[PDB]
Design a protein around this nucleic acid. Structure first.
Ligand SMILES: [Mg+2]
Ligand SMILES: [Zn+2]
Ligand SMILES: [Zn+2]
Lengths: 96, 38, 72, 222, 175, 45, 154, 162
RNA sequence: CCCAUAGUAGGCCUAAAAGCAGCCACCAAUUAAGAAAGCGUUCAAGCUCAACACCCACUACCUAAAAAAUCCCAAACAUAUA
């Protein structure tokens, strides 16, 4: 997941993840949170932060992100894998 | 590019590619390692 | 000319009186159960200890290093 | 997790004195006053002596015939001394000193007037003869590497094999030679004289079994 | 980021190693040396100790004082000033278990050991390994035994240093 | 023998049956059994 | 001429591979897992953050200051122990990178208050005396009053 | 199968992940003991490059292919399908398996030159001007080197160099 | 496909060679990493690999091609049964 570190993460404002521990379709959002909270991607900017929200009766692995342009991007990883959402977020943060 | 019959990687960033009928060794870190198959 | 040369003139008793040296009674007994000269091999440790596996891993690392000397 | 196999311990192989190779001179201690002809039968066919190992476990197996002069021996000994470990590796020469005289005449001279003068000396090397033997307390990758590095420089074909590798290659060779589909072996046709083939063949082919030709060696003839 | 540097306490002149790197980094050097000197003036021996510094993007350096090295303590406890080129065939000196135990219990308060659940057995094993890799040798607890050991080791080490200096002079003469 | 289904407290819908059984066993009397309970509780603590 | 087989070996069903003999590493791992599961009563599985070792030793020192320990185990040696024992309802919580906490005696308040300082340290939950709970479960259980008054209120 | 669906509504891109349906294999295999999808239907060395139905079941609608862990082929069977699919897109087969592009199909340069059994790329090979003498003539390759073990009915090997 | 803290500038001529200038032993802590397996280093920084943590396709049929002078030379067909 070094592409997200080589690209950049400055214009982003606040990101967060929500999932359930007992579900069997929460590994994608789990590894996404693990890759997005590394060392290079976290030290490339200090004006942003992450929120790790863990609920029991959520029953949905939704990941909502937004940057400084006032937009909003929410991606629920119910069936998507990790690389797909990673490259989607990369393209969305590079194009805007 | 340099004409070389036996191609090999001289460092780490060298990646092998197959183009226009010849194997070429491109590298972005050390451009001196560009080889051409004869 | 600068160099850290602070060799104290110790003879036979200046190494126990200059510093607050404690007798053997106050020191615990488990501090003398360590190794002395030669280290530990592989046939002296039981396979149910971490030291044997660490020594085997170090030997494997040494073998890999001795093998990967000509390839690129 | 993965398993951790024990490393092969080296405690029964002691390095002797002088681990490096000795010096090879050009002419011997006494010159040969009698000029000998260039007998080509000293490199044609399989090798007789210096076939198996003796002390070490790694040696260069020759796959062809040829002559080696002083420069080749110097290059080989220099490469060995510069690409080895004196505290872990040691090699012993397997081929003797070059002693076969070669007569060369003057440049731009008419045909005649007897033979020329003896210049350099070479040594006969047959196929399957171990050129150099090296042992020690090392493994198989590095030694095979810096032995094939020299074998590729040799004029004739040569490879870096050991004991287990030689055993395996002989095993697969005999397996391929004992499991032949077509029932027309070169030996059966050469020995029994079939279709009058003995007219264009050679009497030395009865022992070579079609595996040798002049100085080369084809391991795929069967 | 961080810059690893091991300089002397009371001797920190602006230039060698700690010079071009500090110049290309973007921070001052004379102020850093003055701060290091005013922080190390508390030491009445001038013991060389490592220094871990950190630089922030707004060009501002910080100094974190830790514990000195182990080779200096081992050489001070043994009594020899320079290490030997061989181990086993030419021992530099002997150090009892009490000295290395005191050194370990004094050093086990730096930023590397106080921030980890490490017991005394681990640190004494580490210091024994360091002493074995240095050139000295450990021993149970030998009072009169280590007294006689020092009595003979002074003479044998003087003879070894004399013969080593003679060999070095011969090698310097063959030139 | 494994464990329970691991419920939560944000949606109170289920409760362990052992607690209900104990409460039904201890909440059906007058005051003498309450005094006996207090006595057996203060005997130790 | 090589022998031409009637049936290619890649087409016929290959014989099963011989099972390897279990080494002592996994045996010691299972033994120490059972040991730390029998004596300790409070565990908390949390997602391991791929951070630097500096902050890692910092948080290790901050945790061990309150007289607690920490030890993790790989999933390959942990899934059989979780599927053969009584903790069969915790197998979907060990499908990736995670960190297991081994802390003796109930001290959930201090550890929660010291881990909530960073907003990137989530936890899937754990069991509190054979009672599996989640993160919200832990944060509402840490607000319970003291043990003596709850014991004596009856 | 699974597809991605992105919708824009109020400056909020909604990227969904809906899983659709997909067919399965017939519940009556001729050779159930086979380990490969080709071997289970007795298609070992029985197919050619003209079979557009067999090649369309292991490729992508945009021209891509599928790995061995998804399909189920071995090492020698996966390379044969990879070579036969390249001989179809050049001969005009599979018109619906074209790669996506914005608006690049505007200038029609070279016209549709009909071809078949194309082994190498057209605009890459060099024209043979010398062709050698006679014995060591440089012939033009054709067919595929991995399609030599197929069943023949002409009492002659497949001549790939003529 | 990912991944890297520390006892230290382990012992010594040269000013020092701090993991690649030479010697015998090449220690030692938590899960797990070599007093150093491959580039850039007067003395320090920059990059990977082996070892945890993590999933775990083949992780490799070993190497075997060349260009002179009037102008290159017959053409063609991998798929109706030796
Ligand atoms: Mg480094
Ligand atoms: Zn390069
Ligand atoms: Zn098959």
């Amino acid at each position: 997941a070094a592409a997200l570190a080589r690209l950049g993460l400055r214009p982003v404002k606040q990101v967060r993840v929500q999932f359930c521990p007992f579900e069997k379709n929460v590994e994608s959002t789990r590894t996404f949170l693990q890759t997005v909270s590394s060392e290079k991607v976290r030290s490339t900017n200090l004006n942003c932060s992450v929120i790790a929200d863990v609920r029991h009766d959520g029953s949905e692995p939704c990941v909502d992100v937004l940057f400084g342009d006032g937009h909003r991007l929410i991606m629920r990883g119910a069936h998507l894998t990790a690389l797909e959402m990673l490259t989607a977020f990369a393209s969305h943060i590079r194009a805007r | 590019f340099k004409n070389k019959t036996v191609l090999k990687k001289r460092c780490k960033d060298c990646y092998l590619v197959k183009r226009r009928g010849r194997w070429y060794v491109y590298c972005k870190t050390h451009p001196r390692h560009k080889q051409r198959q004869m | 000319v600068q160099l850290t040369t602070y060799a104290m003139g110790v003879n036979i008793y200046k190494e126990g009186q200059d510093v607050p040296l404690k007798p053997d009674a106050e020191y615990p007994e488990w501090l003398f159960e360590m190794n002395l000269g030669p280290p530990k091999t592989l046939e002296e440790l039981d396979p149910e200890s971490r030291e044997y596996w660490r020594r085997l891993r170090k030997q494997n690392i040494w073998r890999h290093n001795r093998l990967s000397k000509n390839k690129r | 997790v993965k398993t951790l196999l024990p490393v092969p311990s080296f405690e029964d192989v002691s390095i002797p004195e002088k681990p490096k190779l000795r010096f090879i001179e050009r002419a011997p201690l006494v010159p040969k006053v009698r000029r000998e002809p260039k007998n080509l039968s000293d490199i044609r066919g399989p090798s007789t002596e210096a076939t198996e190992f003796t002390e070490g476990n790694f040696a260069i197996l020759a796959l062809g015939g040829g002559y080696l002069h002083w420069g080749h021996f110097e290059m080989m000994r220099l490469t060995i001394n510069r690409s080895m470990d004196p505290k872990n590796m040691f090699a012993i020469w397997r081929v003797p000193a070059p002693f076969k005289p070669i007569t060369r005449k003057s440049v731009g001279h008419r045909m005649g007037g007897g033979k020329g003068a003896i210049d350099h000396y070479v040594t006969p090397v047959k196929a399957g003869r171990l050129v150099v033997e090296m042992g020690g307390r090392c493994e198989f990758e590095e030694v095979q590497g810096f032995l094939d590095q020299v074998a590729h420089k040799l004029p004739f074909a040569a490879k870096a094999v050991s004991r287990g590798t030689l055993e395996k290659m002989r095993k697969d060779q005999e397996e391929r030679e004992r499991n032949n589909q077509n029932p027309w072996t070169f030996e059966r046709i050469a020995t029994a004289n079939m279709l009058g083939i003995r007219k264009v063949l050679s009497p030395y082919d009865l022992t070579h079994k079609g595996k040798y030709w002049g100085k080369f060696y084809m391991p795929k003839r069967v | 980021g961080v810059i690893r540097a091991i300089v002397r306490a009371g001797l920190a002149m602006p230039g060698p190693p700690l010079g071009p790197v500090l110049g290309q980094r973007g921070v001052s050097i004379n102020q850093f040396c003055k701060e290091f000197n005013e922080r190390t003036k508390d030491i009445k021996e001038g013991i060389p100790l490592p220094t871990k510094i950190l630089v922030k993007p707004d060009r501002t350096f910080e100094i974190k004082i830790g514990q000195p090295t182990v080779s200096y303590f081992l050489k001070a406890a043994a009594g020899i000033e320079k290490g030997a080129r061989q181990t086993g065939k030419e021992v530099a000196g002997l150090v009892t278990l009490k000295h290395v135990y005191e050194i370990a219990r004094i050093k086990a308060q730096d930023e590397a050991f106080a921030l980890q659940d490490v017991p005394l057995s681990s640190v004494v094993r580490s210091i024994i390994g360091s002493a074995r890799s240095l050139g000295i040798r450990v021993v149970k607890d030998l009072s009169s035994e280590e007294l006689a050991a020092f009595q003979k080791e002074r003479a044998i080490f003087l003879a070894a240093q004399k013969e080593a200096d003679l060999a070095a002079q011969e090698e310097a003469a063959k030139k | 023998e494994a464990l329970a289904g691991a419920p939560l407290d944000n949606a109170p819908k289920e409760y362990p049956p052992k607690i209900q059984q104990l409460v039904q066993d201890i909440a059906s009397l007058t005051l003498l059994e309450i005094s006996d309970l207090n006595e057996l509780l203060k005997k130790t603590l | 001429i090589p022998p031409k087989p009637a049936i290619h070996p890649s087409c016929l069903p290959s014989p099963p591979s011989p099972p390897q003999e279990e080494i002592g590493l996994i045996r010691l791992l299972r033994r120490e897992i059972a040991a730390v599961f029998q004596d300790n009563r409070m565990i908390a599985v949390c997602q391991n953050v791929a951070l630097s070792a500096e902050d890692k030793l910092l948080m290790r020192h901050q945790l061990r200051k309150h007289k607690i320990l920490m030890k993790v185990f790989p999933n390959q040696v942990l899934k059989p122990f979780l599927e053969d024992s009584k903790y069969q309802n915790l197998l979907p919580l060990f499908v990736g990178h995670n960190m297991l906490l081994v802390s003796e005696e109930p001290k959930v308040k201090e550890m929660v208050r010291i881990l909530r300082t960073v907003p990137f340290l989530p936890l899937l939950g754990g069991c509190i005396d054979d009672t599996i709970l989640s993160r919200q479960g832990f944060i509402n259980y840490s607000k319970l009053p003291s043990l003596p008054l709850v014991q004596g209120e009856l | 199968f699974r597809e991605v669906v992105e919708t824009q509504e109020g400056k909020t891109t909604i990227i969904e992940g809906r899983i659709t349906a997909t067919p399965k294999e017939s519940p009556n295999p001729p050779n159930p003991s086979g380990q490969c999808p080709i071997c289970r239907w007795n298609l070992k060395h029985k197919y050619n490059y003209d079979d557009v139905l067999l090649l369309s079941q292991f490729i992508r609608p945009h021209g891509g292919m599928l790995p061995r862990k998804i399909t189920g082929l071995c090492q020698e069977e996966h390379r044969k399908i990879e070579e036969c699919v390249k001989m179809a897109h050049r001969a005009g087969l599979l018109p619906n398996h074209r790669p996506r592009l914005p608006e690049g199909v505007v200038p029609k340069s070279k016209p549709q030159l009909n071809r078949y059994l194309t082994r190498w790329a057209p605009g890459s090979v060099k024209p043979i001007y010398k062709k050698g003498p006679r014995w060591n003539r440089v012939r033009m390759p054709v067919g595929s080197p991995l399609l030599r073990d197929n069943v023949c009915y002409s009492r002659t090997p497949w001549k790939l160099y003529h």
